[PDB]
Symmetry: D3
Subunit: 233 residues, 6 copies
């Protein structure tokens, strides 16, 4: 396990995972009680703390499916982890998707062939654990947080050469594009754990619409609160 | 539209679709008020009637994705249809899935390359409309009906040469196997309509467990009630 | 065998198969002596009767390869069937193909990956049994029936998103497009039985040319006579 | 046209093509009247002569689809050629195929993706021109020559790493394996010319059975006579 | 350029890139004169300094092709970078490869389909810039450093489900396995820049042989010296 | 070994291989001492002689990967051959590549799926043996011969239907296109022997620029000298 330098018991059974380790740090200091840094190999920081009297971990997963699923695999297999909630952002690919929306990823597709390889060569579906999906939905509603539930696409190239990619996603109903969601779901199915991705909208790929920093921050907070409440049993 | 011999206005905006046209007939006579047979080209029977004072259609879609999506495409494009709920059965591929369970298909994968072709060559996710998925879930719970929500796989060959197929589905968490669900979802995304598949368990591919005809019938009734309540706005 | 409700001995060794079960019915009443309905599960009607003192069956196979090969597989494996002749129609994709022509499908290609899966992952040829192909050719000539022998393509999507599909078929010499021929041939090779598809022209995809109902009916009759004479040893 | 050093009019409209240029030479000296060597670039010899008072060419095509279709393309496009009959040998892959049989290749499959590329990305059928196929069949019968008509497979690697290849061909009904037939057929369809492959059995891949040189020679003669009679209008 | 928070001129034309940003830091403090941290977004640290009076940058690229090529793309396109040398480690897959060897990656293959997508759908070669490859080779020899030059494979799943993967690499001559080399080379070809990967052996996948920390450190130093001398014009 | 009619010991451990057997003949008469023709099956001529007192063979390999790798496989497996240097020509696909340049193929890509099949289904790199690549480079420099070292692409269709093929190669840095290089390299890796392709420029696919016969001949001589000096230990 050359990639995580925690002790075997150092993680909660749920790990919330942004891409950016500095985001995990921020969450650990801002939202968690008594967070302790448990891993920092390669600057990929992770923490274990408490939320509303319950144990919970938050850790960066870095960029791209390859990065995410490597960390994910180690958490599951060496650190006893049973649930991973990804918190990220996506580029919006529907007109009805708004800058302030939180996206709950019901299912994801990808151009990474790593999922098909996990599922014995077949193109099996890769989706969020429903109980978690349902819980986050319910909480978003109880909290008056604007959500959209639907499909995302995780692409391997942030700088993809296919100029028709975004229009292709729009034509098929896709809510937005990210890099990792599909990886997490594939990993979760293959590994037999639970997962969900909750995402804010970092850009609108159709409109290019801009936001104030305080609008950006309200999204973030909403996503974190939602991820924490969903995680905590 | 050589495949449906209805008039343009003859369908409700929702169509419930079993595979077997004789099942559609049975549903129209048993559950609907004032059902009228509106189509019978090629013995593929369809009906329009009322449930709890609301207009609703039920029609066979035949066997396999090719069959299902052809009818589906005509309904959407020539008959103004906005929602299709498939009611089917599947072969169970998890030990925790029971003979009496109703399966709500969150998402589906397939070996039909027809979905990838719809979604511009990309392997985009194919899933149920969440509002419908959530509604059926809620109703199943309100009604005390045993549900499981998760992934299905739709295979093109009922008699598939791959002996490892069923074990492959089990290893990846899949709830069961059918023939059409993935087709419906792909069609729905590409066509911009709503869809959901609700399924009973016709066989258990892991245990081979048997049922009385009255157990089989209780499943069926549950599925129909659920499909009707989900459909009706 | 949940899809055919005949007794094990209820079929002749040859089964003629249109897509439409109502077509099988019509053939059984119009051309066969003493036809008996032997199967009607799911409204998919099939018959066994006599032609010129010889036993022969005719049965619908429904729409799409998935449908056709499921029925085909059951006939071969549970009902002792040794020969299947498909009688269908196709959309013509050559200028020299005329509305009144009967097409004898020498070989077929497809976008269904079900054939490659049957043939161990290799893209092996899928063609008509030559003895049958030769016999139908000979009979068409003896009878003065206009035939064309060549290649067909069976596509999975009747409503295919590729606008260049028809021109693509034309550029490569293809006589016309249908939905099932390739499936039958693949099944036949894998199962070790004999097969042939005989087809009329339902539309001309290049010219859009129209026909009187009596022209349409003369094609049909020709195809049936040819299928019957080919079948009968 | 750096590969054929004939003059534009130097070929007959039909070219008979073995793989071995020394075989073409032998045929030109043994069977043709007044054969003239018309090309010898790269030792790939070709001839134009007369058979029964009709003009006819015979030329080596070398080994593998890449070789065959390069020459084929030049013949069609720069030398006005309208028909190519391949005369070859194959490794037999059916028990009922005998050392003395001449195989008429109705259709061919391949692992060369060059055919799919010709046919716009689709896996369209690649088969012999029926009129030619029928004529050779008829002549073989009139001459009392033992024929089998069916499917061949053309593989790119004479020394293929897949040990299950031969059994795979057997399981799917394939008559035997060669290197070029599929290439010729694909070329012919794409180029709009006529073609046919006639083949003797050089080895039996199932039985390993051996032959006297005079048995080998009787096959050859039969194939040549058949190819000549088929070609000559 | 949300991923690098340097100013446009902050990088040298060559960037040396380990996976681990803490490795870049260490190199900047240990080998560079006057290194300045120029980027730290997401804890992905990068530096610009001097080696033997010449300007040079060193930056982490994180784990997996997706990560590497995202950073790579930004460096090339927004920061004027003309050359990237990856310094990494690999799992050895040949018996003749030793724990103390430095590997110069002549060319790389991958299971990432991102390279094929860069090269217009074709599986074009992805290799090191020869001038750089030759220079590093020469320097290794002048310095008495043990090198091996050959092929690497970059796999997307550090935890790959294919148990035959390592034996497969061995059977084909491959020197070892990593995660990113192929990505860098594909990026370099598509972007028109220069690149090379120099790698130490972190594990021997065939022998599992162990090393002292001082043996591990001598490899590292050798690799760094080599990368620096190769980079500096 | 029906394709080479030499005795088992008739070849040197290195074989230089042009495509054209008449080129091998010419080389054997012009550059070798005491060359003896050792094989001529199918007009594919090969020779064994001496260069500067060392034993060396030269043999045609014909056109296309299928041809090349068949001969290559026989040489390696039945004739003890340990090294094959291909001498060919390519169509140039870079502006900086000149008519007088000799190309040293560092690595090659292909549309032949034969390489992937050799390397267990993975798209492993196929490249020249570095020691040979380095030696030829060194000699070219010592001799004042203009070289370029980089990537080639070997295509299966000399007459390829993709009009964007050449521009695609240019966009990705490729030096030029041939038919066989990739095959040789794949064979070499799978078989565990050494290989290298040295190539002259027969056409410039970007500029269409023309040459005198004496310019063409100077290239050739350079290539031969280089191949001989590289081969001879």
């Amino acid at each position: 396990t050359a990639h995580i330098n925690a002790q075997p018991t150092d993680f909660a059974e749920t790990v919330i995972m942004p891409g950016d380790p500095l985001r995990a740090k921020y969450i650990a200091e801002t939202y968690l009680t008594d967070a302790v840094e448990v891993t920092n190999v390669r600057n990929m920081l992770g923490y274990t703390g408490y939320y509303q009297g319950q144990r919970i971990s938050v850790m960066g997963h870095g960029m791209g499916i390859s990065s995410m699923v490597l960390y994910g695999h180690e958490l599951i297999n060496f650190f006893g982890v049973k649930r991973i909630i990804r918190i990220g952002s996506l580029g919006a690919t529907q007109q009805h998707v708004e800058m302030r929306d939180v996206i709950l990823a019901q299912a994801a597709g990808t151009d990474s062939p790593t999922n098909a390889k996990r599922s014995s060569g077949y193109h099996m579906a890769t989706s969020a654990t429903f109980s978690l999906l349902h819980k986050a939905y319910t909480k978003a509603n109880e909290k008056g947080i604007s959500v959209k539930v639907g499909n995302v696409f995780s692409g391997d190239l942030y700088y993809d050469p296919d100029e028709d990619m975004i229009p292709a996603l729009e034509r098929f109903g896709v809510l937005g594009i990210d890099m990792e969601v599909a990886g997490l779901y594939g990993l979760a199915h293959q590994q037999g754990i639970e997962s969900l991705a909750i995402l804010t909208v970092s850009d609108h790929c159709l409109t290019g619409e801009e936001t104030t920093a305080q609008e950006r921050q309200l999204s973030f907070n909403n996503m974190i609160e939602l991820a924490l409440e969903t995680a905590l049993n």
